[PDB]
Amino acid sequence: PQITLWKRPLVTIKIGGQLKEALLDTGADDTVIEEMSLPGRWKPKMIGGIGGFIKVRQYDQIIIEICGHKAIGTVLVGPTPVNIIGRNLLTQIGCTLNF
């Protein structure tokens, strides 16, 4: 698809058996999702945004489905104001910026 940027580029994702709305975010190195449960081992991590840093849980090898495209990658879980699909997963679905 082609997604214009007149409003927030929000999509519906499937993750950990749950449906969530998330923002396609080219400024985010990684994917960060509001508090939820994910299977497997995790490591603490600090990520920095416009307002400074938040502490998150890093989960690796997590399957996500986004606009019919299934991808696998690292998902960070923590107190993010907005669910954000970052570059680590955007690449996998073949997402690019074009102008």
Ligand X SMILES: CC1(C)SCN(C(=O)[C@@H](O)[C@H](Cc2ccccc2)NC(=O)COc2c(F)cccc2F)[C@@H]1C(=O)N[C@H]1c2ccccc2C[C@H]1O
Question: If contact means CB under 5 to 8 A according to the sort of partner, which of a second copy, ligand X, none does residue 10 touch?
Answer: none
Selecting among 25, 29, 30, 60, the annotated active-site residue is 25
25 is catalytic: yes
Q: What is the largest CA-CA distance in the chain?
A: 40
Closest separation in Å from C-beta 62 to ligand X: 14
Closest separation in Å from C-beta 97 to a second copy: 4
**Residues that are catalytic:** 25
